[PDB]
């Protein structure tokens, strides 16, 4: 019972781009760019499309960095999130009614205003490591249990 999602982090040597979600589930947090994979599109195609829709950026080269499964107690569907990274983009980030982009220096990542699971795997992403993770949440603020392991192949 899992649904496919993508998450894209535009990570450059000195900075990372995040977007403040304006509405819906998880509004008020800085997150990567992503969403549900559509019928007839590959996971990577879905990741490229979501980055454009949510940030206005065009990505050519994408790299798989992680796979994270999110469980929300009381919600039947698991989120099967395929995480990707790019340092190679075109365009300028665009603010829309749904999302506000902002660049962050790597030592100023706003963890207090991000999903709690980011504090576990973002440090791996910054050190160019690949990972498989699982987080079980109660509501939007509490991690009940989790697992996280580094892998060589995502
Ligand atoms: N680290 C994280 N942990 C948990 N949830 C996260 C997360 N990062 C992140 O973006 N999310 C949530 O993941 C969800 C992604 O789904 P979404 O943005 O609503 O997209 P959709 O599948 O509806 O398609 P879209 O509207 O085209 O983007 C949102 O509810 C975000 O709050």
Residue numbers in the entry: 3 to 156
Paper text:
The Nudix pyrophosphatase MTH1 or human MutT-homolog 1 (Nudix-type motif 1, NUDT1) is a DNA-damage-preventing enzyme. It recognizes and disables oxidized nucleotides through removal of a pyrophosphate from the damaged nucleotide, which subsequently prevents their incorporation in DNA or RNA. The substrate recognition site is adjacent to and mostly separate from the catalytic site and in MTH1 it contains a hydrogen-bonding recognition element in the form of an Asp-Asp motif. This motif is unique to MTH1 within the set of human Nudix hydrolases and is important for substrate recognition.
To investigate the binding motifs for substrates of MTH1 in more detail we produced protein crystal structures for substrates with different Km values: 8-oxo-rATP (Km = 241 μM) and 8-oxo-dGTP (Km = 7.6 μM) (attempts to generate a crystal structure of 2-OH dATP were unsuccessful). Interestingly, in both 8-oxo-dGTP and 8-oxo-rATP structures we observe electron density for all phosphate groups. No metal ion is bound to the active site residues (Glu100, Glu56, Glu52) that lie in the Nudix motif (which itself is adjacent to the substrate pocket), and this is consistent with the absence of substrate cleavage. This is possibly due to the fact that the structures were produced through soaking of apo crystals rather than co-crystallysation, and we hypothesise that the packing of the proteins prevents the catalytic machinery from cleaving the phosphates on the timescale of the experiment. The 8-oxo-rATP nucleotide is rotated 180 degrees along its axis compared with the binding mode of 8-oxo-dGTP. As a result, the ribose and deoxyribose sugars of the molecules do not align, but both modes show good alignment of the P1 phosphate. In the 8-oxo-rATP structure the space near Asp120 resulting from this flip in binding mode has been filled with a buffer acetate ion, which itself forms hydrogen bonds to the purine base. Mutational studies by Sakai et al. have suggested the necessity of Asp119 for the binding of another substrate, deoxyribose variant 2-OH-dATP, with D119A abrogating turnover of the substrate completely. Such an effect would be consistent with the binding mode of the nucleic base as seen for 8-oxo-rATP, where Asp120 shows little involvement in substrate binding, and with placement of the ribose hindering turnover of 2-OH-rATP in MTH1. In the case of the 8-oxo-rATP substrate, the presence of the water in its original location becomes unfavourable, thereby reducing the affinity of the 8-oxo-rATP substrate for MTH1 compared to the 8-oxo-dGTP substrate.
